[PDB]
Structure formats: structure tokens, C-alpha cells
Amino acid sequence: DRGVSTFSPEGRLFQVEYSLEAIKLGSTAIGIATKEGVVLGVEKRATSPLLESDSIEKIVEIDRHIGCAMSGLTADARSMIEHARTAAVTHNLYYDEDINVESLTQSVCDLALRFGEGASGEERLMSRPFGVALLIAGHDADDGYQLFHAEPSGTFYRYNAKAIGSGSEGAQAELLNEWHSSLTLKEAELLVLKILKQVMEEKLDENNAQLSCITKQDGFKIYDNEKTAELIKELKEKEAAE
Amino acid sequence: GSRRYDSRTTIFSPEGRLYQVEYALESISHAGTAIGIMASDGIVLAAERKVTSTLLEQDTSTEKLYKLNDKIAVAVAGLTADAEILINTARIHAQNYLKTYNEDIPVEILVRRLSDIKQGYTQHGGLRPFGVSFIYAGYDDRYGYQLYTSNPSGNYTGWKAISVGANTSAAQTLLQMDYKDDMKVDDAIELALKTLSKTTDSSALTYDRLEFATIRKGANDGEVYQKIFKPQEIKDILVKTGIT
Amino acid sequence: FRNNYDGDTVTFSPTGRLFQVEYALEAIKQGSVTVGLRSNTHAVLVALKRNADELSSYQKKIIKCDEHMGLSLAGLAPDARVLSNYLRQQCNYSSLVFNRKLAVERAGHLLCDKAQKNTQSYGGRPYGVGLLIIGYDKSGAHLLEFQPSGNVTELYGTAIGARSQGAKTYLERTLDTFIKIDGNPDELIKAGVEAISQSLRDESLTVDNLSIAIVGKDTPFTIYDGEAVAKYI
Amino acid sequence: MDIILGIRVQDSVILASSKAVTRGISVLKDSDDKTRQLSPHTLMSFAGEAGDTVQFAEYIQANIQLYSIREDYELSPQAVSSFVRQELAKSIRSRRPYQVNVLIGGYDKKKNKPELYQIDYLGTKVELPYGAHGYSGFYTFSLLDHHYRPDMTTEEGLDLLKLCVQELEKRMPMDFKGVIVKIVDKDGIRQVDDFQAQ
Amino acid sequence: SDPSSINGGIVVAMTGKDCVAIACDLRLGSQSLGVSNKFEKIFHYGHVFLGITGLATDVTTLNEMFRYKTNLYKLKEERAIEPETFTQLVSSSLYERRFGPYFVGPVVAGINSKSGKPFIAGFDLIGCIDEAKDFIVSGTASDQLFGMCESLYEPNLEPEDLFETISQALLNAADRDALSGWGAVVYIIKKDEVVKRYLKMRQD
Amino acid sequence: TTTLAFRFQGGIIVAVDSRATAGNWVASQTVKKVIEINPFLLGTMAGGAADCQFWETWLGSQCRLHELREKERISVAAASKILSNLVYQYKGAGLSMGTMICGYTRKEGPTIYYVDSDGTRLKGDIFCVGSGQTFAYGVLDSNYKWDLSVEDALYLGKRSILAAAHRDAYSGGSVNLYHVTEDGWIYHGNHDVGELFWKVKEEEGSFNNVIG
Amino acid sequence: MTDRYSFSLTTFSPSGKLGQIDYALTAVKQGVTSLGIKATNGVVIATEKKSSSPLAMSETLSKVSLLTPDIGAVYSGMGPDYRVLVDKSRKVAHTSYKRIYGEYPPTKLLVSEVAKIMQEATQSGGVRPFGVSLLIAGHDEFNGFSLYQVDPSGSYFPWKATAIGKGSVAAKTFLEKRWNDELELEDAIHIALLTLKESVEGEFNGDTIELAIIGDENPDLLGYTGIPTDKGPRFRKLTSQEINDRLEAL
Amino acid sequence: GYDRALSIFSPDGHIFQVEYALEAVKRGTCAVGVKGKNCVVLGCERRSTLKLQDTRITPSKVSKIDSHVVLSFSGLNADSRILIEKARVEAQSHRLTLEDPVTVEYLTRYVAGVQQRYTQSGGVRPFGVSTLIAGFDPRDDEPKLYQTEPSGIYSSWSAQTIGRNSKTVREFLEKNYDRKEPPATVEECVKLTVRSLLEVVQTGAKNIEITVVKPDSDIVALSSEEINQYVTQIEQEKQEQ
């Protein structure tokens, strides 16, 4: 056949590019970074009315100052989350301090290219790349609030705002116009809720969508349905207002 | 690299079937038929010897009936050499159990383990599966007489009567037709011979083309006894049951 | 043709080529441009950081390997991290065991050797990144160009990445000039930014888009980004 | 060592085990239960090295519960004691052997008879009408050799044990803080909460 | 300290006219503490008998091992193992643990089912074979047993006579050993049948 | 060293001395012998300073990891067994630790586990560990009542350490107090034994054999 | 480097055939004919010494090999494969039997060992099956004389008489006509020579034929005296001269 | 030694071996689970390609992982055994180290992780199995029902079905299950489960097996009669109209 770590004639790794395709088919996830914190929202996208929507966990805590959202083959993200949590806790045990958001991200991204059937560089025992992308958001004393996009390519970019998943190209264009360096946390919340509503196949409500944020003061929190339901109601009103 | 020559023995077909298992079963369908029938007072194992010659030494031969334990035996359908590999490890698992608990191994425990070995060749390792199907006849003090079957996939099930190898479709219909819960070992012995007699791809059904065994609890004793009939013993039971 | 001989790095084509290696090289060309040049007292690295969105950051393209050495990358970022990390360890080993700073020429040899292994063995893949290494050791300023093929070359200046040919011809012209910019870092950098602007087209180097690094005589390899490079735009 | 006694009467097995846990100069606990239920009708008591004792007991407990679930059946007391003997027989020749002695008391629901097994850390197993580990046998065996009868009732067994414990409390130098007693029969395992004065 | 003096016990085997006998005490102690009076040290696999003295945990383990090995042997060979063959199996199984041996003193007794010839053999803890024609002793009272046997024994005794001899050798040797006694069992073995008798002896 | 922990109506009292000695040398009179595993869990340290400090801090890391994984507060039973099992893996290597793992969960209520390097893990109501333990036990055993007030319980614990600090050459310096509630532990100060002794002597009338 | 062929080279085809085994059998068919006949007091195995050149010294190449002092083997198919199989068979007879029980393995068990080795080359990773069929003849106290055939698949079966290779079909037919359960060893040898003659194209003498028997104990081939229970090997290769003597009575 | 990547990405972003693993599940006998207000029921169908089996000894479709948790599945039987054994082992380990039996979600997350792992590990193919794991968390009375599939994905359901014709029975459950008023009784819950199976089993008294799980390790499997009775009462609900 053909190696799993083969280069295309254009200088790209096939398995990584094909990986990105699976991620496009995933549920939408959006993140907005502001000087008041970072918001992370996702589309639950349940496949049947009998499925209990709250058992859908696409936003998870890495540490008190770091949270993350996923999109794509979500089962693939468990070991990544695990590695991330271990890395953050381990750092604290060794240095009696919080791990920087960028370092935590760089560590997760180090697993990315560790795949193949015997690549001469160490012992990358993983048959294929991860089929999921992540938005790592958090805060640390040196670089304040931060949002990162970690891809199966091992590369991670920092963004002021970013959307991944099925409605990403559309949602990203929206974030381009809506984002400005002075957004308040509340504005970011509604803004994420609004973009999810535009790209979601279903009518956004507090059950098929979920919000969360991380602030220096209270750390990472996942908004409970009631809190989000109100924000949704508030969004509809400001929209119908003009 | 080597990848080029890898057949990939452990993958799914677009229909969710395991190529090699399916092909191994196909292989087994050309193997001499083996039958298992469980009665109220015992179990009967009968199998047809595939290919024979005037010069073949039948007295010293055994290609289908093997003793695993003093209380468990199996009838083989498939590659004999593959079968012996599995039979040997099964014989060892039985003794490990005996040494650990000081009790003979329950029949299902042994069957499940052997089936698990088979299942392994199905999910990892890149090796071909064993081209073998077993009918297990045994006795333990929890379920008494038991009859099981395992094939290349590693799946196993229990039966009152069953067959493996060639013409199982035909053989099964005949068994389902004349089997009765209150049967007796002698009835079962007769049913087995009749069934093989009708499904044989050969002219007649002679003794030199058969292997026969019974697991009974000889009333005048109280313990379980396995009997692997000898050429002459098969020849006899063959005339008696009216097949001469 | 090609299609039958480019499935892995352990296969020579009928003409003696190694396509997987060549395809890897193609990843460099697709990479953002970066320039390197030196005088007799300093070595400078100027790299154009590329951004994904206008909401994204401009990915760092320069990594410090030791107080006297560092490099710029063009291509797969992860591979640059792996290679620079290896370089950091080799620099470290030299210091701890021999109390000796690693010679830039030695580093080049080590990188060549590490990359070569990933072009003759089944299962692995060539590195898909280009590197420009600058340093100041016991023989002065040095600039090295590293290619995934494992080929490493010492130069007075050069550039890799998209449209790199622009800056390269410029430097091959400005040679006699900048090679004498001794004792004056600001000049060397300015000359570096002039070589790099020769590969622009899309936009123009901004503040959060330009990245500069320098090393030399009494200057430990340091990286300037943002405001710090403003005085060069 | 601690007190570990066992007595197999007509229809049950009784295990008496000291409650004290002493560490050096101080008695740290006086309500310690040196026992683990391996299955509904099988109890194991133990004494020996400080940490090995419980770690071993729980390890055996885990293995038997796993067997119970897998087979949906309860191994006979004889089978369980053989499993335990083999674990200890491997342990004695390992890098760091488990220094634990045990008594396995179980009610065989198939044979409908109680059974008592004594096994030391070397993997030495024996089946007995009554047994003990440590110095306990030295003070109590002469009493059991005398009063023991195969047809004893659970009640008679408890009285015979009480006599043993009294001899232990009179002649033994250490204060083992009384014993916890447990009965194993056709209906399972139960604790005699009233032995502090029975 | 000495593994072969913790539990106590003895075993003795003898040859006679077309017969063999093997006997053992029933004690199992913990140094000076008697623990069991029902610890038999004689086992059999088919028509081959094995007596084992020494550390009890190893006596039990070895028995379980040889039961395991002779069971597989029968399944492959399709015949029961013979005395001569089993002796080799015992020997190589023991030597396999040359530098971490089982602390036992095995004794084999049986009649070859094909030649009818009587057979007995002894082993040291690492497999060295002693194939005696007259008798074999083992255990904490082996010195006493040698004294008893070297005097009481004589060739070609009939089964009923060998019984009296083997028993008197066992019994009187055990009564001079603090770690032996508490009962005794004697096996009289012939081509066709085998009789097992429990003896009456002091219980101190 | 003298460390103690006891269960009562108001939760748990944890008291320790603060002396460190190597032979007859008093290395310090201000050492911490209580590790704040996390806001809800406390660990006491007796024996080897390094061993207790290192593994009890590591325990905290394991507890945190558990809570991120199970989105639920770890039980004292589970927290103590993580330490116990770790320590047991090292049995024979020379670790030296006598410790108390203390917590207050909704599921268990006030809980104290004694865990040492021998691999011993004991759940209990009262524990004292260290060369001064016997002294603290005398004071605790005769004044302990489940119905003690948080105020009295705190004093009892402080008094018990004082008793040991006085008689035991290896105990002293100061007393560190803690109160463990279901909502977390509450630090109750550092009390220099020097000053505390005289104060308690006067106000209490005890330590009559000492001239003041 | 490193053998990276950890997957089977023999696998099932849609029809249920194991190609590599079939092909191995095909190689056996092209091989020179070899046969075996069991008598009441012995067994004989023979084959043709197909000298690949007159310059080659045929003696320096034995197709009939002694495995144990009471067991011998012969084959048809790929000689190199047979040669290594003999080395392995001689070794397993020791490691898996003589070193355990202090006596040589009985014919059926050694055959079982050989068979296992062959079965493994049918499933283990990175190998091809052995391209040979063996005929093992031996004797052991509790089983008497026996003759077995082992095929590339690892399957084996006991025979009264049989042949393998080139003209097996014809040879088997000829053996069925002359075999009976009362043949003495000499009769079997004679029958062997007659059967082998039909398969030989050129010269047929004691220099072109190789023949061995499993018969009585040869105390003269032991090498020492002093142990009553050691009477000598039952395996004996016939000499060129011994063969010719019997060819005149052909 | 064998570490070939069998589960890899294809151009469109799919992992065919995981995809085909699902096809194996669609082929397996149907399984369903519905949670009541105080219990969870698990029903499975029994094939009939061959009939003459010994029901006593033939492995049942619902397996106990611990005394308070059960697992059913659709797909390759041989494959399920491996997961069942691992789950049982993990259940005992968890009790040994945490001193508490596993929650249903924990046990589910474990099985799912094992499945995910077999989708990106060299030399192994994914499990051709999907599972339904039900039970009650220790000292809890709220019913739990989770489902896992070859990819390693899992979630909880009020009711769910897997296997052949599960499309059909799911519809039934979607328009016959009210989260507002879940089957408030073991009886009406078992009924809803048998009703849903009859939509695809086509008269099979001996082709339908039920298992009821109640709080505090109260687990029991119904007998042919008990079930046959439910069938009978249901066919009348139809005819009486």
C-alpha cells in the first residue's frame, strides 16, 4: 500500500490532510478571547431525541486556569485531555506554580506527529494522527488571556477568536468583523451564541449548545443550562431590536 | 518495504465480515463431517475420516477424535496440524486449572479459553486464523453433560446435537428432524450413524472411514468414562444399527 | 514513472532520485521567507512570520539553541522544534562535558547526520523543514543553510521559503557591502530587512509581522519581535 | 503475633481474631478486624507482617470476586484454599515474600459441610477440625484436643472458644484486646457482636 | 533454619518377591508443635508411587507438578508412565532447580507393567538418583531408618512378610525421631493389586 | 516529633510540634509537620521529613488528577490508599514515614487514616505519631469526648502537644493547629511552646513541678 | 534490517485453499520417488539417489537419515529443506524428550514434533512452508514398528506401506497388490526394490539406490559392551553390496 | 512485532476499518435498553439461523460486569468477550484501589477507551461491537443507561437500541417514550421493551430475553413464560382494536 507518514508531491502529509477532513465534519466549536476572559462554546449536536444532551462533553477542564473545546472524532481527544491534565498537574508538582497556557498547548501538540509504523526518530507508537482539533483557552500571569488552536499537524496558532468544525469557514468570516480589542466578556458570550445559531442545523437552545469561559478570578467554568438559556433570550431580544 | 507483501489477515470487509475467518470456514466445509449428540445418559461423538487407503494404518490412526481431559473430548473438522496446536494448549490449560484449584476444569471455562485464543488471531498479530472447528463433548458437576462448538472466529455455542465440516446444512436438518430431549446414548449413537450415512459424499459408510466416541457415566461405578471405539468396535455397532 | 518510486524514502527512482525527500523539500518552498547574513563580527536572522487569519498570531520562526547559536525555520514547524531541540541538547552536551561552546560547523554536521538517517530507512519520513543557522564561535560569525536532504552549507548570506530567490539575488549582489558591516549591528539588520523585502509581494513587513535575531562578538543570540523591530520598518 | 483461631463444628466454622494492632510501644487500635470475606460462604483470617497482611488479603479477595462474576458461581472452599496456597507458594520464592499466615473458613454448599483450612506463608496447607497461627496453638490446642467433638453445635463451639480465649488472656504476655468472632454456615457469614462477655 | 527439619516426616520403600512396599508417617509439625496427624507423604500416578519427605509446601507442590506432568504424558504417550521413566522425570525436574531447589527427599516405588520387575529409587534435593535393589530411606529419621533396614531386611520376602518388615522399620525409626510419628500408612504393591494399611503407634 | 489527629462532633483537630533534630542537634524549631494536600485534605508528617514532604505533596497531585477525571471530590479512604499503595511498592527500600491523612467529606464525614512506610493503613478516631506520641496519648485519652466543642477540642489538641513538647527532648519549638470541616480545613495559628508553657502553667495550675 | 515480516505468508483464499501449502505439495510431486513398507518384524524405507552429475560423489549425500537409534527418515521434494528438518528433528528428540525422560522418543511423538515444526512454517510470520514430505520409520517398545508420512501442512498419517513424489500414484497401486499383514522384513525389502525399479529411469544398483531398515537390535553397531539393557540400534542403512546381493534375486 | 496501521484516514476523512466495524454491529442481533423511573431493562433478540441449541449453557447476551452493572451488545460475539473480561477486571481493580464499586459512567468510559484505543494502535483492528451498559451507581437510585460504539464514542440514553433493524425499533421508542413520564414501573417498563422488540422480532417468545436491573445490585433475568406473558398481553392490545 502506502506509508502512513508519506509526503504528497506538494509537500504535505497525507494522513494529516485527510485528518483535517474528518475535523471539518465535526460539530462547531468557537472561542473568543477578551481582556475580561475567554469564552468557549460548542454545538452539542445530539443524533437522536432519546440521547440525553448533557452527557455530551465537548468542553473540558485541563486545570483551573485552562479549559478546552474539541471538534471532530471526539473519542480521539480523551488521551489528549488526559495528557494535558497530567502535564499541568505535573508542572505544578515540579515548580509549585501554574503551567503557562502556551507550554501546556505545546506539550499537547508534541503528541500530534507521533504516529507511524516505525519512524526513525524515537518510538512513535500510534497508527494514525488524531482526528480532532482543539481550542485551548486559559490565563497566566505573563501573557494574560489566551486562545490556541491545536491541530493534528502538531502546529498551534494563537487567535483572538477562532471557529472549528463544520461551520468554521462561515463562522470565522463572522468573527473577522465582530471581533475588536475591547469586547467585554458579555459581548463575547452573545457573539459566540449568535454565530453558533447561524451555522447550526438545529435551532440553538440551552440544550444543543453549551457555553463556558475562564477568568483570572474564577478560572474555568462551564455555564449551566439555565445561565445559558437566559443569555440566549437576551440575544434574541437584542437581535429583534434592529 | 515489507508492507507490500502483507495480506492483512485481520481486517473487515465493507460488509463488516472478517475475510480470513470466512475463508477458513469455507476451508472447513470440505472437511470430513463430525457430529455431536447429547443424551440424558451421555454424549456421542462421531466423525467421518476424509480420504483413506487400503494401506492406511487405521488401528494407530486418529485424525478427528481427541482426548483433552478425562472428562472432555473434541471432534475435529479442518486442518489436523492446526487442530493439534490448539488441542495441546487446551490440554495444558486444563492442567493449569487443576493444579490451581484442585478441581477438574468446568467444560465451558476450557471452551471459552480455547475460543479466546482463536479470537486473538482474528484481531491482532497479522497471522492467518486456525482452519479448525471443534465440537466439545464433556461433563462437569455443574452442568453435567455438555456439547459445544467453536470455529475460526472464536465464537462458541452449546447444543443438544450439532455437526461441523461438510454438509452441515443437510446433517443439521436430519438431526433436528429426529432428535428428542429424552433420548438415550444408544439412540443417539444410532442417530449419529444414520445422519452421517445420508450426508456422506462417499459410496457406503464403512468402519474404516469412521471414528466413534462416547462419554458415559457407567451406572456400575458413579464416575465418568470416555470410550474411543476401536476399529472392530465401530464395525460391530455398524452392523447392529443396521448398516452392516 | 514517479508515482511508482515515491511511496517511501527507501526507494531510488530509475534516474537516482529520492522523491519523498524532494517532496519534503517542497514543504520548505511553501514556507514563509526568512533571510540570513553575516559580517565578520555579527550574524543576523530576519524572518517573515506568516499568520493564518487576521485574528491569528504570526507564528514564531526563530529558535535560540544556546547563548551563541540559533536558527530560523521554513516549513513544518514541528520538525523545526524536533531539530532545534536536538541542537540544544548537542550544544548543552558540549558545555557540560567539555566546557566548550559547540562550533557552528559541528552543529551543521550533526544536523546533516540526524536528517540523513530519515532518508535511508523504512518507516520514517524526511524532515519537512529548512533551517538557517547563525552563530558566533571561536572562529567568528557563521551562517548555515540546512536542507532536509541533509545538505548543510556555510554561506555569507541566503534565504529560504517562498519567493526566497528575491532576497538571495539581492544578497548575492550586496555581498561585498554587508560582509564588511563590522561593529555595527543596526546596519547589518537593516541590510537583512532590505534583502527580505526583496521577497515581499503580498504585503509589507509590519510590526507584529517582522522577526529579527542577532548574535556576535559581544552579543548573545537574542530575538527581537514587535515594538523592538519597529525601528527597522 | 496476633491471635488467629479457627474451629469447625457440625454445621459451621468459627474464626476468632484478636483486635489489637500494636506498633512498637503503643497499641494503635483495639477494634481491628483481621478478616476478609472472599465469597458469601468463605471467610479468611490473617496475621503476619505489617503491610503484607492486608495487601495480601485484599488481593485474594479481589481475585475471588472476579472469579465469582466471570463464572456466576461460587468456588468451593477447597478450590479457594488451593488458589491461596499456590499464591503463597509462589510468593515464598519471589524477591520479597508475603509474610502472612491465614485460616480459610468456608461452608461448602454442595457438600453441605463446614471446612477449615490453615495455610502459612510458605504455602503449607492443611485441613483441620480446629487450628491457629503463631503461639495461639501452644496455649489452646490442649483444650481443643480435650473438649472437641465433631457433632458440636455452633453454641458449643463458641463456648469452647471462649475457654481458649480465657486461657490466652491468663497465660499470654501480650494484651491482644479481645477477639472478634465470626460464624460461617449455610446462610453465610455473620459476626457475634456479643463476645465481650458471652 | 534447615528447610528439611521444619515439618518433619519419613518415607521408606522396599523390594520383595514380585512386590514392592512404600510407607510413611503422617506427621506435619511446626518445629516442636504437632499440627496434623493426617499428612500423607505417598502419592501415585497410575501404578507408580511417589513418597516425598522434607518441606511440606514443596511436598505438596511437587505432587501437583508430577500429577500435571504424568497427566500430559498419558495423553500423548497413550499409556501410563512406568517407574523407570518416572524416575528420570523426577530427576530432571529436580535438577532444573539446581540453584534454588525444592527441599525434598523423593522416593519412587512400583512394578514395571510390562516386565513385572519391582522398582524403587531415591533422590537428593537436586535429582541425584539412587537406584537400590533392597531399600530406600528418606526424612528426619533417615539414620534410624538405615539402621532398621540394614538389619531387618532380607531379599525376596513375600508381600505379607515384607509388610511386617517395612512396618517395623518405619515404626521403630519414627519413635526415635521427635519430628516423626503421629500415625503411619503402608502400601503393599503387586502387579495386579495394591493394599494400603494404616498402622497403630504411639501418639507422642 | 509529636503529631496527633482526632475525630469529634465538630470535625477533626490536627496538632503538631515544629522541632527537627538529628541526634542531639536541634536543626530547627520552626519546621512544618502538616502538609496542606489541598483545601480539604491535611496530612501530618513524622519520621523522615523528605519522605513525608515528597510523597504527601505528590499525593496532592494525585488527588487533583482524580477530581479532574471524575468531576468529584476524592474520598479520604481513596486519598489515603493512594499513599498507602505507593508506599507499599517501596517496602524494604528504607522509606521512613508515620502519617495521618485527614479529611471531611459528605460521604464519609470526619475521617482519619493512619498510614506508615510499613504499608499499614488504619482508619481511626484518635492517632498520635512520633517520639512524643505516648505523652500526647495520656492527655488525649483522659479528656477526649465526642461532644467536645470546636473551642475545647482545639485546646485539647494544643495541650496534648504541649505535654509532649515538655517531656520529649525531640519535641518542641511551637504548636501548629488545624480544624477540619466539611468545607475545608481552618488554620488556627502557631503557638511558641516557650510562651505557651508559662501561660498554660499559670492559667491551668499544671506543671507544678516546674519553678516559674 | 530486522525481520519486519511478522505477518503470515500463507493465508486462506476465497475458496478455502492455503495456496503456499498446495504449491509446496506440488514441489513434493516433482521430487524423486521414495517409499516405505512395514513388515511384521521390521520396516524399510528407500529412495533413488538421483546423482546430479557423475562427478558428484553420491555417498556424500544421504537421503535416508537416522533420527534416533530406532528411527530413520526419507523424503521427496526439496533436499535442503529436508536437511535442516533432520537437524531439527535430531535435536528436538533430545531437548524435548531424551533430556527429560532419559530415553528416546517413541516414533509417533517425534513425528508429532517434526509435524509441529512444519505446521508453524505454515502460519508463523515471514516464512514459507517446507517443500517436502517425509516418511519416518521407527520402533519403540510399547508401539512396535511404525511408518508415518508428514506433509508440508504438518499433517501426518500412519501407513502399512506408501510412496511419495514423482511416481507415487503408480507405486502406491503396486504396493497395494503385494502387501499383506504377514510379510517378513526380507519380503518387504524385496517388494521395495521391485516398486522402486518402476520409478527408476537409468542404472538400478546399490550405488543409485539408498535403503535402510528398522529391524532387530545391532549389538555390533553399539560401540561398547557392559550394559545388558543396551543392545544396539534397530536402524541400519544397507550397504551398496547388500543391495546388489538382493537385486540378483529380483 | 506486527504493527501495521490498519485503521487510517482515507481522502474524505473516514477511517474505513472503524466504519466497517459498525457494519458488523448492524449485522448483529438487536439489543435495546429503556430506563424506567426506578429501573433499567435490557432486551435482546435471539437469532434462528439454527435452532437445536442448549439454552442452559449457550452464552447469554446480557453480562454482569459487577453486581450492580450489566452489559449487552450487538456485533461480533468473540469480540465482546474481550471487552467483557476487561470491564470485569477493571471493576474489581477500582473496588480494590478506591474502595468503592464503579459508577456506570466510569465503567462505560473505560470500555469506550479500550475501543477507541483499538482504532489507533498498530497491528490491531477495531472491535466489531457496540454496547449498552446499564445499572445504578453505588448508593444511588437513579437509573443509568449508556451506549458505546467501535469508534470509542459513548453517551447516555433514556432508551436506545443497536443491531439489525435498530432503525425500526428506535423510531418506535422515539414515539413511545416520554421523558416527562418514564415507565414508572418495572412492569410497564418491561412491557415497553418487549413492545419495541416485537416490532422486529416477528413473534419470538423464545427469541426474546429480558433482564431487569433495580437499585442496590438487584438484577434478574426473566424466564420464557414471564416474557411470553408480556407478549400475550400485548397482542391483545392490538386485536382489541
Ligand SMILES: *C(=O)[C@]1([C@@H](O)[C@@H]2C=CCCC2)NC(=O)[C@H](CCF)[C@]1(C)O
Ligand atoms: C519527628 O518525627 C522528627 C522530625 O525531625 C521530622 C522533621 C520534619 C517533619 C517530619 C518529622 N523526625 C526525626 O527523625 C527526629 C528524631 C527522631 F528520633 C524528629 C525530631 O523526632
